[PDB]
Design a protein around this ligand. Structure first.
Ligand code: C87
Length: 300
């Protein structure tokens, strides 16, 4: 009460934050490209600015937690927090982060295949694993690892780029039970997340396996996880029947197929991540080392 939490409301003043482009909309948020030009001279750093789509009270509280999460992270493969803009005369909140020019990895794989080969995919795989190792040191569970939430700085660097579903483990538990679910990315979820709403480092590893699948399908039309699972389940299914069949399929070892051209050894990594036995999934440290050894064992 007496003294409010430290914040720097003059770091990004709304009057100097200049719109450049709309970048995308999520479930609860919208992201713009802006230029922060305090010397009103048409210069300044380019930044990404996350805002809410629907500014209810509950969403604002969750957004504050997301901001605190991102601010606490400093790693080469995590999008860089810059600050907050308290716009509308300090009656609204916007999150300021660095701007990464090539957008989501999902889009980059579809739009920039000319500059992607397996070496690059393994580099991105490694970088994602290292960012996730770092999250684990903070006891953060991402809960939405997917190529749409990874951002591309350049052909040699990707970063985990969004944290809107991230949760902090309780002190005395190795899982977080989500007890207010909203929209769920079911085709990336581990079975125990689907059946018990339990999220953990190990369920992030499961989702990472799906990310690795996404990378090697090159975001090919008809090969995405939703399209492939729907083909396996039955394309005509609708509503909860989809979830029922997805759960039953996963529990009895149904899995996404090996992408065309994917090496057996990379598919093996995927299938080890997709273990119904939570404790048998590899760690992100195991995965980064294995991927970097594969890369390093190539000639050159
Ligand atoms: N709400 C919600 C879920 N999160 C986002 O939508 C989200 C989060 C972060 C960023 C972000 C952060 C830093 N840099 C960038 N760069 C970026 C560059 C290009 C594009 N696209 C280029 C192609 O057309 C569509 C936008 C998208 C983001 N994005 C974008 C969207």
């Amino acid at each position: 009460n007496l003294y409010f939490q430290s914040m720097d409301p003059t770091q990004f003043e709304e009057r100097h934050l200049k719109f450049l482009q709309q970048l995308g909309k999520g479930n609860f948020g919208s992201v713009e490209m802006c230029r922060y030009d305090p010397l009103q001279d048409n210069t300044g750093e380019v930044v990404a600015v996350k805002k809410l789509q629907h500014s209810t009270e509950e969403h604002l509280r969750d957004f504050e937690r997301e901001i605190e999460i991102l601010k606490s992270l400093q790693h080469d493969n995590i999008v860089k927090y810059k600050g907050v803009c308290y716009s509308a005369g300090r009656r609204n909140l916007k999150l300021i982060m660095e701007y990464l020019p090539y957008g989501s990895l999902r889009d980059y794989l579809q739009k920039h295949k000319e500059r992607i080969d397996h070496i690059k995919l393994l580099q991105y795989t490694s970088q994602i694993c290292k960012g996730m190792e770092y999250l684990g040191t903070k006891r953060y569970i991402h809960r939405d690892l997917a190529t749409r939430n990874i951002l591309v700085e350049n052909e040699n660097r990707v970063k985990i780029g969004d944290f809107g579903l991230t949760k902090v483990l309780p002190q005395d538990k190795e899982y977080y039970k989500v007890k207010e679910p909203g929209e769920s990315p079911i085709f990336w979820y581990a079975p125990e997340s689907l059946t018990e709403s339990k999220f953990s480092v190990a369920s992030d590893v499961w989702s990472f396996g799906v990310v690795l699948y996404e990378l090697f399908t090159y975001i090919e039309k008809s090969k995405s996880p939703p399209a492939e699972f729907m083909r396996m389940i039955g394309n005509d299914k609708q509503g909860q029947m989809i979830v029922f069949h997805l759960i039953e399929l996963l529990k009895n070892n149904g899995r996404l197929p090996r992408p065309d051209g994917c090496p057996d050894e990379i598919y093996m990594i995927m299938t080890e991540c997709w273990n119904n036995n939570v404790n048998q999934r590899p760690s992100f440290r195991d995965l980064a080392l294995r991927v970097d050894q594969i890369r390093d064992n190539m000639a050159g």
